[PDB]
UniProtKB/TrEMBL annotation:
Keywords noted in UniProt: ATP-binding, Helicase, Hydrolase, Nucleotide-binding, RNA-binding
Entry keyword Cell cycle: no
Protein's UniProt name: RNA helicase
Pfam family, one: HA2_C
EC number: 3.6.4.13
Matching SMART domains: DEXDc (SM00487), HA2 (SM00847), HELICc (SM00490)
Primary enzyme class: hydrolase
Native species: Drosophila melanogaster (Fruit fly)
Length: 850
DNA sequence: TTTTTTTTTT
């Protein structure tokens, strides 16, 4: 027990908080209290019972619009422009099986279509059953949902199949993604949507009565959502015989899904392309004849049994060179430089997509490609058009990366794994695949997750292979030996095994599945129950579950919000404490991403501007809200895309960040926590310029994540989390390297690792804020000097009667919080509950340092 | 002194 700074408050100010809390304690309608107790009362069978008669709308169909529409395409499938595709999309592999697949679903509730890309499973399999449904006179019975892993896919596929039916978007074809939609007609419709839309909709339709048939696409990539989804239909389908499911997969361990539903009918469907042929690096340096210069027992246990088998098909110095390991992978960047320098002379016109693990090495091969020191490269410098591709760089949102190059120019793209699925570039005939990328890896023991460079898996090299295909024959240069391919895993660790489960075990209670261990162990891969429990314990600590593990009324509010519970709780507190707009900003950035790019060479000069937008508040999260305020003031000032370029920000990210804030705003007003659904509305923001208060609500979200700084000196810091480990601020964070902070304590959303240990994001907090909103407060005395602690961890001194008033104020803040969850209502500014709020504002305001 | 990547109703 070593003690810190002094939080005591003047006695004149405590006499005033004491009068407001005696005021609050003389206080003497709820549908929500009912719907909560209604849900704890009910078991799973009446749960299934009651929800049946609620969503009946697909029990009803409309004979005449059935009749009208089946004559309406039935007549004009012979007047001509449509049926140029009725002929032209039997081009694509899937429509050989149109009737084969129709019959299959008629006799099967769940089927599996395996196909590789270009077959058109998702383009058409939906329209085969709608045009079938319409043709038999079933039109209004039929409403089909087709789920996709990413947003842009859902839009593009919808907008493209829309246009194939000579309909504008919004008639028989639609898409719905979060906070953006073109909804199709309610019946005889095709709706594409992200996997997460349909899980949120499960809360109001747990047994999926509002769709006739569901199609789950790209399950082979094992997103959490699709794994969850087929997990919940083993519960859902028993009670819905007439619901039809169509699984859709690439051929990537296709038969896991076939085995997970009984042994399911499976449709294998043709690929479309020419080849893109594999060369491994024993083929690459057969042709490049490069050499290098500026663990080993296994490399050598791996390589030589296999060079003893390829002995005659290559020269002795090429098989000699599988034995330096830095041959394979990214270990030499001048090697890959000389391969792109190499493909430019030989091989016909075409694009080079180069896959490297991460952003550091996309820079170094960028620098080598545009600033070659070798006279062989200085030739090519200006006859290559070089694009960095990364989540954090601008080139992914412009149209240039997808373009054809200037005549006489050859386009080279140096990309992370983003180019495998997320981003698609159609003119690539050449892919160079390092085989190395980066992956989150966590150690449940240490509470460290680190970001480590890893080998890819077979499943990925085969899809980067495909990327070199779609326009004419490509070739795929993989920089590892074939001996290395046989040792990689089939597919990457499915994400549910590496995910925080806080949000899912909680949301699962709305579907009335209250044993996580029972249910989550029924998925294709069962999460480790120590993750399941480490999730249960975090929701018991923010008190979304009581200590029996049962949903509390605050938990039921947070399960409904589309954000992690920690941050859902932070949104709710910001409604009660009247800073709605700042805090939703923080919340929105943490569950999504920061608006800031970091283009190459501007690392130096994207960190000035993050600092100028922090306004010396040394809060990563309010720095984003400052940026957001700046972004609409550019939309009123109409300084528009000027503004977004000066400051290196994503037009598209801010569009979404601002749309989520109104989503949070709109649900809290629906939930009767706010009087206005406008998140900038005055009544919701009257504390929004009080910075000490905003860090208290920020700490109220990220608690218990805390760090302390003992160092003065840019500067170097000596810092520790509550975990005991020594930490520093990530360099991308704004609190990296400064000095003279007004508080020695910080809260953080995520701590992750390369070279040290880092906090990716932080806000300086004052000790008093943590006392009020945290836990682990006891009063006592250390030597003989009086103390008040937080988390039983950071012990600060305290006066005794500041102690009792905060302790009694935490007791009143807790019971107010519990009633506010049970009986949602906005706090009116003149009521009794508001004088408990004023009491906290006044205590927190003492930390404005003037 | 650093940056794998998705994504959430009415």
């Amino acid at each position: 027990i070593r003690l810190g700074c002094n939080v005591s408050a003047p006695s004149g100010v405590l006499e005033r908080v004491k009068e407001l809390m005696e005021d609050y304690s003389r206080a003497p309608d709820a549908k929500f209290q009912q719907q909560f107790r209604h849900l704890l009362s009910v078991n799973f069978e009446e749960f299934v019972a009651e929800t049946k008669e609620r969503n009946a709308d697909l029990d009803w169909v409309n004979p005449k619009l059935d009749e009208r529409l089946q004559l309406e395409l039935g007549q004009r499938q012979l007047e001509e422009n449509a049926k140029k595709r009725l002929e032209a999309r039997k081009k694509l592999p899937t429509m050989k099986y149109a009737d084969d697949i129709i019959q299959a679903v008629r006799e099967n509730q769940v089927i599996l279509i395996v196909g590789s890309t270009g077959c058109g499973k998702t383009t058409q399999v939906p329209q085969i059953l709608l045009d079938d449904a319409i043709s038999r006179g079933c039109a209004s019975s039929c409403r089909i949902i087709c789920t996709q892993p990413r947003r842009i896919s859902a839009i593009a596929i919808a907008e493209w199949v829309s246009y194939e039916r000579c309909e504008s978007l919004g008639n028989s074809v639609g898409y719905q993604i979060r906070l953006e939609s073109r909804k199709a007609r309610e019946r005889a419709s095709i709706t594409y949507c992200t996997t997460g839309v349909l899980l949120q909709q499960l809360q109001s339709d747990p047994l999926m009565h509002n769709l006739s048939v569901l199609i789950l696409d790209e399950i082979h990539e094992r997103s959490v959502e699709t794994d969850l989804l087929m997990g919940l239909l083993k519960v859902i389908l028993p009670h819905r015989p007439d619901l039809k499911v169509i699984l859709m997969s690439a051929t990537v361990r296709e038969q896991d899904f076939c085995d997970y539903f009984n042994n399911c009918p499976m449709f294998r469907i043709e690929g479309v392309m020419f080849p893109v042929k594999m060369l491994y690096l024993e083929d690459v340096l057969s042709k490049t004849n490069y050499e290098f210069q500026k663990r080993r027992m296994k490399h050598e246990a791996m390589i030589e049994p296999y060079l003893r088998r390829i002995r005659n098909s290559y020269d002795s110095r090429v098989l000699d060179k599988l034995r330096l390991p830095e041959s394979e992978g990214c270990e030499d960047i001048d090697f890959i430089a000389d391969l792109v320098y190499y493909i430019c002379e030989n091989e016909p016109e075409g694009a080079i997509l180069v896959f490297l693990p991460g952003y550091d090495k996309i820079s170094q091969l960028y620098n080598i490609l545009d600033k070659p020191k070798t006279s062989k490269g200085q030739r090519w410098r200006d006859h290559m058009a070089v694009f960095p591709l990364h989540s954090l760089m601008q080139s992914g949102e412009q149209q240039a990366v997808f373009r054809r190059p200037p005549a006489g120019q050859r386009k080279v793209i140096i990309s992370t794994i983003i180019a495998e699925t997320s981003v698609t570039i159609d003119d690539v005939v050449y892919v160079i695949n390092s085989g190395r990328t980066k992956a989150t890896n966590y150690d449940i023991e240490t509470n460290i997750q680190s970001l480590d460079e890893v080998w890819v898996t077979k499943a990925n090299t085969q899809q980067r292979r495909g990327r070199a295909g779609r326009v004419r024959p490509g070739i795929c240069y993989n920089l590892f030996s074939r001996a290395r391919e046989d040792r990689m895993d089939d597919i990457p660790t499915p994400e549910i095994l590496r995910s925080k489960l806080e949000s899912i075990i909680l949301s699962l209670k709305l579907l009335h599945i209250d044993d996580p261990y029972r249910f989550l162990q029924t998925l294709i891969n069962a999460p480790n129950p120590e993750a399941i429990k480490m999730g249960v314990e975090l929701l018991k600590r923010i008190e979304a579950l009581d200590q029996t593990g049962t949903l509390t009324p605050l938990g039921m509010h947070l399960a409904k919000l589309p954000i992690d519970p920690q941050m859902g709780k932070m949104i709710l507190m910001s409604a009660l404490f009247c800073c709605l707009d700042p805090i939703t900003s923080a919340a929105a950035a943490l569950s999504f991403k920061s608006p800031f790019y970091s283009p190459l060479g501007k690392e130096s000069r994207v960190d000035e501007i993050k600092r100028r937008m922090a306004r010396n508040m040394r809060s990563d999260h309010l720095m984003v809200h400052n940026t957001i305020i700046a972004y609409r003031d550019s939309r009123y000032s109409h300084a528009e895309r000027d503004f977004c370029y000066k400051n290196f920000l994503s037009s598209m990210t801010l569009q979404q960040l601002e749309r989520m804030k109104n989503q949070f705003s709109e649900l809290l007003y629906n939930y009767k926590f706010l009087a206005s659904s406008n998140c900038k509305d005055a009544a919701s923001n009257k504390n929004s310029e009080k910075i000490p208060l905003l860090r208290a609500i920020i700490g109220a979200g990220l608690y218990p994540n805390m760090a302390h700084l003992r160092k003065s000196r840019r500067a170097i810091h000596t810092m520790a989390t509550d975990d005991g480990r020594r930490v520093n601020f990530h360099p991308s964070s704004v609190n990296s390297g400064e000095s003279g902070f007004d508080s020695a304590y910080f809260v953080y959303f995520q701590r992750q690792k390369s070279t040290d240990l880092f906090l990716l994001d932080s806000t300086m907090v004052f000790p008093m804020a943590l006392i009020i909103f945290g836990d682990g407060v006891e009063a006592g005395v250390t030597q003989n000097t009086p103390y008040l602690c937080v988390a039983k961890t950071y012990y600060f001194k305290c006066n005794r009667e500041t102690a009792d008033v905060v302790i009694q104020l935490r007791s009143n803040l807790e019971k107010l919080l519990l009633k506010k969850a049970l009986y949602p209502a906005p706090i009116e500014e003149n009521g009794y509950e508001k004088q408990l709020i004023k009491a906290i504002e006044l205590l927190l305001s003492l930390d404005e340092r003037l």
